[PDB]
Structures are given as structure tokens and as C-alpha cells.
């Protein structure tokens, strides 16, 4: 990727956001028992 | 400010005062930053004693 | 006169600072929480972190 | 986020190799660096705004 800016005379960030799925899914089996499962992707943790 | 020199004089007769500028603080919207969050040193816990 | 690169005589080690290790631009190593600072290889801290 | 040099005019940005399924699309901003505290740690020593 190519980003082209006015200039500025001070450190700045060029923020950008990849978009995609964050999810997870709660399982409840027992009593006092939370087990979860994660998956971010694209971009997987 | 008409001198820079102490004390009380004629001088400091022509002093002019102007209002401080407006200075709001509070806490911030929907209170950001008093929690942590996408930290993994401060990571919040939520888990089953069991 | 020494030359580290060929004879050992290593001397600046206590410059390191941390170090951070990512495979293929996303995945952290060795990531899984194991380090009190999961995100990377903290050589030293300065007073801050005592 | 990338960092943009004062005065800097271009911005390219790498990504490695990897897999893009499931990809939606890109989202983008411009920040300073002096508003956007650190959040790589629990706490920012160079964080001097409010």
C-alpha cells in the first residue's frame, strides 16, 4: 500500500484498519465452567 | 505589564489584567482509558473458580 | 586489536533493550502468554518497571 | 499504525505474504503522534497530553 499526504510539520500516524472478522463462541458444558474459542481472521492471533 | 521592575510605582498603574482561558476537566466520554483493554500486561479475567 | 566476530571477546551485551519476534507479519513468538510481557523479549527495565 | 516523519509526504506499507479470506476491506485515518498515547504498556512516560 501507497499512501500519499499533505505534509505536516509534526510526527503524525497513517491509522489503518484491516477489516475482519473478530468473533468467538461461548461454550457453557458444566457449573463454574466457561471455555471459549477465538478466531480472528483474516489476520489470526 | 509596563516594567519589569518591583514594586509599586506610577508606572504599574497601567497594568492591564485579562481572564484566564476556559479550562474544562473531566472524565471522558463513556469513561475511556479508566479501564485497561488490548493489553496483554493488564489483561482482564474472567474464568469459572471451577 | 580484538575482534569479537572472530575470537569471542564479546563486550556490549548489556545493550540490548528487547526484542520482538513475528512470524509471517502477524504471529508473535513465542506468543501463548508465556512471558510476563507476552509481546516480547524484555532484556532490561528502567527504574519504572523495578 | 505507521508512523509519518514530519514533512514526510509518502506512506508505503508492507505486508507479508499471508491469507486474505474472508478479508471485508480497509478503513484509514491520519493521527498525531503527540495525541495517541502509547499502548504497548501499562504505562507511557512520554504521554504529556490530556
Redesign the interface.
Known sequence: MTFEVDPMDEPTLLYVLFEVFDVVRVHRP?????ETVYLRTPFSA | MPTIKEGNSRELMGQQSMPNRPNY?AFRDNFIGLM?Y?????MGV????? | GSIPYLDGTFYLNHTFKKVAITFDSSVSWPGN?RL????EFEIKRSVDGE | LYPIPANATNVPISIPSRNWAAFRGWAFTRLKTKETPS?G??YDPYYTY?
Request: charged share 10%.
Open positions: 458444566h457449573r463454574g465452567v466457561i | 476537566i485497561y488490548n493489553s496483554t500486561g493488564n474472567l474464568a469459572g473458580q471451577a | 502468554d510476563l510481557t507476552p509481546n | 499502548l504498556s501499562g490530556s
